[PDB]
Ligand binder design. Sequence first.
Ligand SMILES: Nc1nc2c(ncn2[C@@H]2O[C@H](COP(=O)(O)OP(=O)(O)OP(=O)(O)O)[C@@H](O)[C@H]2O)c(=O)[nH]1
Ligand SMILES: *CC(=O)N(C)CCN(C)c1ccc([N+](=O)[O-])c2nonc12
Ligand SMILES: [Mg+2]
Ligand SMILES: [Mg+2]
Length: 166
Amino acid sequence: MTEYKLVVVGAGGVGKSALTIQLIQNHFVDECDPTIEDSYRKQVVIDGETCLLDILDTAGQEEYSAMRDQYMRTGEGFLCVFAINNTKSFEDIHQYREQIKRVKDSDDVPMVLVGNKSDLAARTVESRQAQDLARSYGIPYIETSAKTRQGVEDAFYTLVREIRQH
Ligand SMILES: Nc1nc2c(ncn2[C@@H]2O[C@H](COP(=O)(O)OP(=O)(O)OP(=O)(O)O)[C@@H](O)[C@H]2O)c(=O)[nH]1
Ligand SMILES: *CC(=O)N(C)CCN(C)c1ccc([N+](=O)[O-])c2nonc12
Ligand SMILES: [Mg+2]
Ligand SMILES: [Mg+2]
C-alpha cells in the first residue's frame, strides 16, 4: 500500500502528541507524559487515494543527538510544530528546519509549519509572522488545535501533498 512516512518535530510541550492522537484516534489528550518516540499507523483516505500514514511522534528535547537522528532519518515528511503562545518554540523552528535538512542530507525536504493551540487566546506569535516565516522557507503554514480539532486534518494532509509533490 501507498505509505507516507511522517515525523512530528518541535519543542517540548507544543502539542505534537495531542495533534497526532487527535488524528490517529479522534480525541484530545491532556496528561503529564514526557514523550519519547512512539509511532502510530492508520489507513486513511486522502483525495481519493487510499494510503497508510506511519507517524513518528518525537520527544521535545533541548539537546540534539545521533539517537534522535537515527529515528528521524526514516521519515519522508516533517510536521514542524510550535505553540502560538510559546515564543521560544517558534524561534526553535529555524533549528529544526536546519536539523531536518542535515539529517535528510537535502535542500528540499517535504515540510509544513504548524502553529498549535489555536483555541488559546492572548497569542504571543502573530499569525502574519509565522505565515511570513513559512513563505520565506517556501512551505505551507497551517494553524491548529489538538483541542477543538480545527486544522488538524489540514496540517497532516497538506504534508502528504508536499510528500507527493517532491
Ligand atoms: N489548549 C490546548 N492545549 C494543548 C493543545 N495541544 C497540546 N496542548 C496541551 O499542551 C500540553 C503539551 O502537549 P503535548 O502533546 O504533551 O506536547 P509535546 O510537544 O508532545 O511535548 P513533548 O513530548 O514533551 O515534547 C498538554 O497539557 C496538552 O494537553 C492545544 O491545541 N490546545
Ligand atoms: C508532570 C511532570 O512533568 N512531572 C512530575 C515532572 C516534574 N515537574 C513537576 C516538572 C518537570 C519539568 C518542568 N520543566 O522544566 O518544564 C516543570 N515545569 O513545572 N513542573 C515541572
Ligand atoms: Mg509528546
Ligand atoms: Mg519544497
